Subunit: 305 residues, 4 copies
Amino acid sequence: HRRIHFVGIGGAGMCGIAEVLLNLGYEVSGSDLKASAVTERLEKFGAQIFIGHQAENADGADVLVVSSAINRANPEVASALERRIPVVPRAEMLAELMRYRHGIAVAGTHGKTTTTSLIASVFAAGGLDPTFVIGGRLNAAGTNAQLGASRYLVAEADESDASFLHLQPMVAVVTNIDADHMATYGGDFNKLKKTFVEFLHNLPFYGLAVMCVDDPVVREILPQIARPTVTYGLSEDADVRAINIRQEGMRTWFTVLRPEREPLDVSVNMPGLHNVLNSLATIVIATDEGISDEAIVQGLSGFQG
Amino acid sequence: HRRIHFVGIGGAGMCGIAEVLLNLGYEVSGSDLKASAVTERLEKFGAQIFIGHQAENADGADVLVVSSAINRANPEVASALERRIPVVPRAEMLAELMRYRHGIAVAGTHGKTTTTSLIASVFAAGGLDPTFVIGGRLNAAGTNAQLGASRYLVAEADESDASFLHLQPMVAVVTNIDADHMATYGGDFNKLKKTFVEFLHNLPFYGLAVMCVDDPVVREILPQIARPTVTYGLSEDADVRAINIRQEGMRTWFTVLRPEREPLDVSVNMPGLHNVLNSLATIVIATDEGISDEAIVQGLSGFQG
Amino acid sequence: HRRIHFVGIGGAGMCGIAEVLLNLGYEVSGSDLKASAVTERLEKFGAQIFIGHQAENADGADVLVVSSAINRANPEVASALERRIPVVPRAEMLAELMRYRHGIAVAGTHGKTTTTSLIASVFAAGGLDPTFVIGGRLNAAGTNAQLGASRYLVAEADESDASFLHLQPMVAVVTNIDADHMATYGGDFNKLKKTFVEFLHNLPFYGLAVMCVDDPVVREILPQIARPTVTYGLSEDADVRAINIRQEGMRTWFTVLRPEREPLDVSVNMPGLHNVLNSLATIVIATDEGISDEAIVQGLSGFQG
Amino acid sequence: HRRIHFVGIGGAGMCGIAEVLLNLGYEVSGSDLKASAVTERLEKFGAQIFIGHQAENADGADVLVVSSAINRANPEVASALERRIPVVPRAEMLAELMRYRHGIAVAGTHGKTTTTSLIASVFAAGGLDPTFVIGGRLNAAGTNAQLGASRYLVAEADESDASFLHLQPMVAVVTNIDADHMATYGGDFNKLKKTFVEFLHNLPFYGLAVMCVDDPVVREILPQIARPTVTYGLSEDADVRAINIRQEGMRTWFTVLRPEREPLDVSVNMPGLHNVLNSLATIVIATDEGISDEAIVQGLSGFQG
């Protein structure tokens, strides 16, 4: 399959996915009601754009991507269904892109967004220009380059999304495990917990699970994770720890302890222990990746918030 | 992570996996009670072999693979558990090999074995010398070359195996969906059915699902497969069908119909409609792959049984 | 080989090469008399910096890189020769970077520099953020990202350079063949011609040769190029031509004709037929690579000089 | 460019090149006067075969490959020349195959053939089933598998061949440098010598040169080789040496000394010091590639002659 066709390609969650697919070398077409700078950018990069939803727009596509739900009223969708051309939802296509890159999946019911941003800021500090996903939208610091150009794709993994268990990361973070989204799992928190174990098991045997042992549910499932693991937190027995947490004005300073390294002092612009933990997750990922102390410090301290 | 240690590396389903990991460039070590020609061949290909079990044999391992359960009486396994070295069961490591190759997963409650063998036979006749997994044992035809050398890895996928949902194939077959293994899904055939759907959704959007629509359960779940699909069977509405089934001795002849090709006359050396169907499934994969008609005929005809 | 040691890593032509090698995943170290922002950037990206020259700085290195400004008395190079560690000049290391990337070699005695710049500008318009080499110095637009990140390396190819015939490009341009550098080839123009033929034969059989047939010597060697070729110029028999050249201020307008395409009005911010020709070479490369007409029009016109 | 057409595809040096290109994923067509089992095998592997020569046979080809000189009279060759479609000689396409594989180029005026066979034998014993090239004909041990399937391509490199300096190997061997082919270089041994330096300089900085220092001309040019180099010979200063040479029947025994290894006893089934040296060269390559002593001992011992 080589031509992907987006119904509503100008839609916020959609344009960024089409751009990555263009970066990977696929043929991309798309349809939208209105033309905008977002459609002209995609066009400049090689997408075929159609204005209006006529059934013929889907002609030649090997797969369709739709924004919300499968709408057989849309003649583009209906025509593909009538010819058994697969129609995948936006969220699954988003998840697939990680199969083409060194994917860092940031799970956890709270702390996903800030941790993704801190990772991205630190990797950018190291010159790696990562593409990252927050709230379903793809981004990168560099604005003229195409999304997906980096070797790295950093994304939050929502355990209430139907593609959670289809992520294929190289590294996976679990900041915490909360019962917010029990309803996705038959309102049973034990099923939700088992899903996190399954998620962590989609890592390869050479992957890396990065786990907040300060969360007692994370600490409970740790022995079940048959993958390389690095723990972090304030806990005395965590692999990577923060001590001497202090404040200078509106900024938080602390010392990070890591295996086989000297203690490293660090600061971040945001308050609260949770942002200290989000920095530790970030420091774990960057350390394992080979990023320098200078880039870690620079990325953590420059993140606005 | 780059050195894998096998507890019982000489075992029947272990040595093949060690050999493929050697072929992929990893460092492989293992232990066994008895020195063997199996362990000698592994040593010739670069594995480090220890005779007898001693906790030091696991030193420097990034991961251990064990033959079944975690017999934590074994010193190596216990030394790994203490040092937080993941201990991965045999079948998980076997399933993960497909991420390194063009994987073909042969699923279906019955027909898995013959279909996998037929596929290997046709690809072999096409010069592709695939590695294939039957009954948990890795094989190939040319026997001096390491397992894994082929671009292709053809494996049976058992839905009662805990690794079923962790296979990452490029092409998936479903020969039939029977209720033999309802116990694995809490004695619920509907749970079983949904797992075959989840299985097929591990295909990427450019993968291929090959479905026997002669099976009514496979026909029921077909509309939920949001992946490229080719159907086969004797049903008049199948994409790839067999017609004019005849016999001459212990060999079955029939004509295969394919979209956009001329009718092809084929024989196979095995009786019954089910082997006609396993041949249809093979003809589908081979055709998608680009293998010549000549290799298809020779692959199917020369297979003994 | 995995550790490259630059003697004078902060020098003007050395720092870019080291940064690319870092982007390729090599271990990079380097010495210099003075720490600078250049040495800080490389350090932040993972290079080990030594200040001051001393024999042990080269310890562990698999290869040394030296520029013209390095004496044989330099202790680091002296120690390397004593241990049979290879010492390669900066220009050769520079020419071998194309082996990792899709290399576009911009050759031809006059116009190398503008044509390289035009290619980079057009490719950037399509969001490809290429790294490019002008006067031996590596650059890219995205300032925070590491040199070498793009799939594309566009480089001046200089026939007076000893490494001319070790370039391994995927596409090669010859703007013109002049006698300026006869002295590199025994002071014999015909040997210089033969050198250009051998240069183009470094292309793979699937590569592209882009030849200005307005140059009589380029036209003369054309039947010796056993590679795929697209010709450009004002000559009516060129594959890609400019017609209806006109002016509107400091801007030059013309129509470009391409096989199997509609005519495209184009404008560049530089005078003279030579800059029309440099634009045709750019358009040929861009068209072949798949870049949109909009990116071609925008890259060409937005270039200053 | 994606379709290669072979004029005289059944020929002795042509069919193997076509087969490797098939294994590389290219479209291959070919013409011949008589159908053969050779053309049938290639047809089974994907090649379109044409019996008899006709100008249409070259329709759609991006490059042609010819058996000797550019026949001009041949209708397919003439058709291609009229469309400016490149026509490469057999030897040039054969040398291009190395850019796709881990290429080991065995050069030297004498000993090329035995040394290539010894390398193939050792690699095969290590389970790597190399494709190797002797007398312009490609071969491999396993016979149903397509040529080119191995990661390794081992080829003799002849300095009287027009493509000698177009090889792109990973490892280069120089067994010795004689004046046999002075005529190729204007009857001047000093130019011939310089060609061997330039040949070795087509290695990347991560390549490896393997040099017999028992040859005084090899020893003379050694300091000019700015690539990683391992020396071998009987000379007391060679990096890898043979000592304790003795006989036991038609079998030569000797001990091999290697940097940072224990001495290894080996035997070969051929007489003479020159086959001790060709064995030494084979041992350098195998050692650097990581092949075990068992495979070295077995490959060398089991080679007939």
